[PDB]
Structure 1
């Protein structure tokens, strides 16, 4: 009878209670019941961070802020990945992301198995910028999540609009 505030006609997805974004209770097609909210929140945070970075990347490289090196000059955002994948640049970025994601795999596996007690999305980078106040810490986490969601939708937009209309730039 909790009646999730987002979709009023649906019952509250119970496992979302206590999590940072759970006060809105938006999980229709309730998947917190089938999938552990630890995994769902780790995936949400990973997508949000990747999109918060990819948005800025697309904007900066579409505006014309290419890196110093040649093989980075004159390459548009669209035909960029297929270019740096043959220049050897996407391989090393894949290596760095691979070690970061092996760290992520260890963290997710140990957390879901219950061995470690890290929080979902916590990679232990930071902890000296956290507001240190529990209400303020949860507020900062909610800011991260909301910005990540906005950035996910924004990058989806930006990318689709750019690739549908190649002769354009960031305002689209």
Structure 2
């Protein structure tokens, strides 16, 4: 149990990966656990790619754009047009992968697995035991990556330095 001085949440049976009965604020109750699991997986995946993006943008810059001082400021040096292209591409991807159901009500109409958008092009998730292990690994890495992203974004905003650049040039504020 994650919080020993509190009871186990009623809705956390342990079916999902990474469930250690951690929900003191009780979002498991009064909400849809499938919705929360899909939200957690999407946040984890987005931050998981964002951390790699923050790492890459320091040393690798696409020839079309001009690199900013920080990957946070790389958002501003790129034109506003092209940014909305990314926004609309993400909208299309989130519409087609979700089957054009985009609300807490109509989603999970077929009761698919939360976070299962049917994207396994390399076919890695075949063995069910390995599938469960990879589910645990993915959820734990997403939980780590969301904290890591929320940290490195603010470090870059405050120090105006890259993350590896900050680690090699650590200084007080």
TM-score norm. by structure 1 comes to 0.84
User: For residue 151 of structure 1, what is the aligned residue in structure 2?
Assistant: 145
User: For residue 33 of structure 2, what is the aligned residue in structure 1?
Assistant: 37
CA distance in 1, matches of 2:84, 2:62: 17
Deviation per residue, 1:7-52 (Å, 9 max, x gap)? 0111111222211122x11111111011111110011001000000
Residues 105, 30 of structure 1: alpha-carbon distance in 2 compared, 3 angstrom cutoff? farther
* Unmatched tracts of structure 2, length 5 or more: 167-173
Deviation per residue, 1:106-160 (Å, 9 max, x gap)? 3564886653121100110007110x23222111101000111111011111101
Number of aligned residue pairs: give it. 161
Measured on the aligned residues, the alpha-carbon RMSD in Å equals 2.1
TM-score norm. by structure 2 comes to 0.84
CA contact (8 A) 1:111 1:117 kept: no
Residue of structure 1 aligned with 2:66, choices 53, 66, 73: 73
Residues 106, 145 of structure 1: alpha-carbon distance in 2 compared, 3 angstrom cutoff? same
Residues 111, 13 of structure 1: alpha-carbon distance in 2 compared, 3 angstrom cutoff? same
User: For residue 141 of structure 1, what is the aligned residue in structure 2?
Assistant: 135
Larger RCO: 1 or 2 (CA < 8 Å, sep 6+): 2
Residue of structure 2 aligned with 1:106, choices 86, 100, 107: 100
Q: Which aligned segments of 4 or more residues in structure 1 are displaced greater than 6 angstroms?
A: none
Deviation per residue, 1:47-81 (Å, 9 max, x gap)? 0000001111111112x200122xx1232312222
Residue of structure 2 aligned with 1:160, choices 120, 144, 154: 154
